[PDB]
Every structure is written in structure tokens, then in C-alpha cells.
Amino acid sequence: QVQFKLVLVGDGGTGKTTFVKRHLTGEFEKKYVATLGVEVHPLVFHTNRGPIKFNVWDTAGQEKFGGLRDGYYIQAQCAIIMFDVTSRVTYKNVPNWHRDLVRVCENIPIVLCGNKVDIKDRKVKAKSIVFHRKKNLQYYDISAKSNYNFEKPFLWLARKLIGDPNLEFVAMPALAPPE
Amino acid sequence: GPHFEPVVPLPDKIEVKTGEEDEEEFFCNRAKLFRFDVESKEWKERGIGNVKILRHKTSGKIRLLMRREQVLKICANHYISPDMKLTPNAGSDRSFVWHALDYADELPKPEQLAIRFKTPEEAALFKCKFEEAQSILKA
Numbered sequence: 001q002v003q004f005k006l007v008l009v010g011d012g013g014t015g016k017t018t019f020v021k022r023h024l025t026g027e028f029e030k031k032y033v034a035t036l037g038v039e040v041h042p043l044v045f046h047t048n049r050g051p052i053k054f055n056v057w058d059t060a061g062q063e064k065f066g067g068l069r070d071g072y073y074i075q076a077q078c079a080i081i082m083f084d085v086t087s088r089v090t091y092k093n094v095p096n097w098h099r100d101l102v103r104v105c106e107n108i109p110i111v112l113c114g115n116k117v118d119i120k121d122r123k124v125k126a127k128s129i130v131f132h133r134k135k136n137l138q139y140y141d142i143s144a145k146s147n148y149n150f151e152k153p154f155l156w157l158a159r160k161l162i163g164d165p166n167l168e169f170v171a172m173p174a175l176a177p178p179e
Numbered sequence: 180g181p182h183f184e185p186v187v188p189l190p191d192k193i194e195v196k197t198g199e200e201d202e203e204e205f206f207c208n209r210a211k212l213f214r215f216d217v218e219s220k221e222w223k224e225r226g227i228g229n230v231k232i233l234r235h236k237t238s239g240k241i242r243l244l245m246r247r248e249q250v251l252k253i254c255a256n257h258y259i260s261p262d263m264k265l266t267p268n269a270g271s272d273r274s275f276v277w278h279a280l281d282y283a284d285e286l287p288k289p290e291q292l293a294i295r296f297k298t299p300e301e302a303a304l305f306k307c308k309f310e311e312a313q314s315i316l317k318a
């Protein structure tokens with residue numbers, strides 16, 4: 001079994017749980033139910049090199065969970081930092097998310113994601129997203145609503161942790177169903 | 180750009196195995212799939228990608244198969260039964276609903292499913308092939 005620990009961080013309301021759920025079942029949860037501490041969810045992908053699993057640590061974004069998530073971060077091999085392209089405060093808080101990650105695990109591959117690009121008018125324009133440039137992180141515009149780039153964070157991280165930059169997601173083998 | 184150390188022994192490339200090499204396609208088309216949540220009593224999205232109706236070349240069994248695009252996870256996998264009924268949505272000629280014992284999560288789950296196509300032409304070919312698949316069994 002080949003797997004990785006992934007901590008998912010970002011302000012409350014950014015779409016972390018929604019993103020995880022979308023991968024997990026296909027659903028798009030309209031409601032906002034704040035995550036209580038952390039939810040650990042397995043996500044399996046298939047590739048030209050075999051099955052891989054991300055053990056995703058879906059952490060709550062509220063400040064009060066600051067002390068606990070330092071414990072969540074121990075042994076994390078990668079992370080996604082989520083922000084909301086609809087809420088300027090959430091891009092403004094990104095540097096603190098990065099700082100919080102790097103002070104517990106130094107040189108781990110990290111993706112910055114600007115969720116919610118489906119909404120017609122961004123409050124955070126493309127040209128204001130620059131943090132990934134100063135910290136040499138991988139960036140993606142994403143949307144848990146429209147699936148836009150929604151596989152990318154996992155592929156890119158998969159490529160880095162596995163050590164194969166040409167790694168490709170392949171079709172999940174279709175086992176024979178019930179009867 | 181920058182380089183990271185891989186945290187795992189780099190596994191060998193494997194031959195691409197779909198699970199479908201023993202079947203032939205009757206129907207292949209992209210669609211949007213929904214699954215009704217019994218508890219909340221609402222439709223939930225299940226996936227977007229290609230629906231396929233496949234017949235096993237030896238057993239003659241016919242199933243429905245759907246993979247989510249980009250991530251390529253299965254979001255529907257069940258044998259078509261003569262007992263199944265495709266029921267158009269009120270006022271909609273782009274969608275149908277049916278019940279199935281589905282194996283997408285690799286676990287047998289009864290589900291009611293909705294499938295929507297972009298053009299009513301795409302839907303009609305699905306109905307047609309779906310129901311034609313059902314022409315087997317008996318006589």
C-alpha cells in the first residue's frame with residue numbers, strides 16, 4: 001500500500017470540506033458546516049505506476065484550532081493551502097498558513113489553491129495572487145463547484161512525493177458488480 | 180519548479196488495466212449523474228463523465244459504467260436489469276431516473292440515480308440503447 005499524509009489548511013468557509021467531499025462522493029455541499037477540529041479522509045487515485053492513497057487531514061480554519069493543528073501537521077508529507085477568490089481576507093491570511101506549515105515540517109511540497117473561480121466576478125483578481133511566487137509554491141485556480149482543476153493539486157503533489165513528473169492518473173479498474 | 184525528495188520507493192509502471200477488456204460498448208457518452216440522498220431527501224451530484232453500456236462478450240451480461248473525468252474514479256457500476264424502468268423527468272426530455280444495485284464505491288449499494296444529457300438527442304440514444312439492452316432477457 002502506497003500512501004501520503006496530506007494536511008489541508010485555510011480559513012473557515014474557503015471550501016476545504018466541500019473539496020474533500022466532492023472527491024469523496026461527487027456531491028457539492030451547498031451548506032457551510034464548520035469542521036470540528038479535523039476530519040481524516042482517504043482518497044485513492046490510480047496511476048500508470050499503481051494505486052496511491054492520500055490520507056487527507058481536513059482541518060478546521062478557526063483560530064482557536066491553532067494549537068491542535070500543529071499536532072495534525074506532524075508527519076505531513078504535503079499540504080494544500082485553500083483560499084476563497086470571493087473573500088480577500090482569505091488570500092490575506094495565506095502567508096500565516098504557510099508559515100504555520102513550514103514551522104512544523106520544513107521542506108514539504110505545498111500547493112496554493114484559489115477555490116470558487118466559478119463565481120462570475122472575483123474579489124481576488126489573478127494579478128493579486130502572488131504568494132506562490134515569493135514562496136515557490138504551485139498554484140491553481142480551482143472550483144469544487146465546477147470541477148475546474150480539481151484533480152490538479154493531487155496530481156501535482158503525487159508527482160512530487162512519488163518522484164515522477166510524468167505520472168498520470170489512469171482509469172480506475174471497473175470490478176465486476178453484484179450479480 | 181523546485182525539487183523535493185520523494186517519500187516512497189518509486190513503484191514500477193504497470194500495464195493499464197480498465198476491467199473492461201472483456202466487454203464491448205453499446206453506448207458511450209458524457210452525462211451528469213445524481214444520486215438521491217434518502218435521509219436529506221434531495222438530489223446530490225455523483226459525477227460527470229462518460230456513461231457506457233457494456234456487454235460482456237462471453238456471459239452476455241450488460242452493465243452501466245461511468246467514470247468521473249479528470250480524476251477517473253467510477254461513479255456508477257451496475258448490471259442493467261429487465262426489471263429496471265427509466266422514467267423521464269417531468270417536462271424534461273434530457274433526463275431519466277432509475278434504481279440500481281450500484282458498485283461504484285466497490286460496495287453494493289441500492290441507489291436511485293438521475294442522469295442528464297446535454298441534448299435531447301443524446302438522451303434519446305441512451306434510452307434507446309438502455310432499453311434495447313433490456314430487450315435481453317427472454318422472449
Ligand SMILES: Nc1nc2c(ncn2[C@@H]2O[C@H](COP(=O)(O)OP(=O)(O)O)[C@@H](O)[C@H]2O)c(=O)[nH]1
Nearest residue numbers: 012013014015016017018030031116143144145
Ligand atoms: N461558488 C462556489 N462555492 C463553493 C465552492 N467550494 C465551496 N463552496 C461553498 O463555500 C462554503 C465552504 O464550506 P466548507 O467547505 O465547509 O468550508 P471549510 O471551512 O473550508 O471546510 C460551502 O457553502 C460551499 O458550498 C466553489 O468552488 N464555488
Ligand code: BEF
Nearest residue numbers: 012034035060061
Ligand atoms: F470551517 Be472550516 F471546515 F475551516
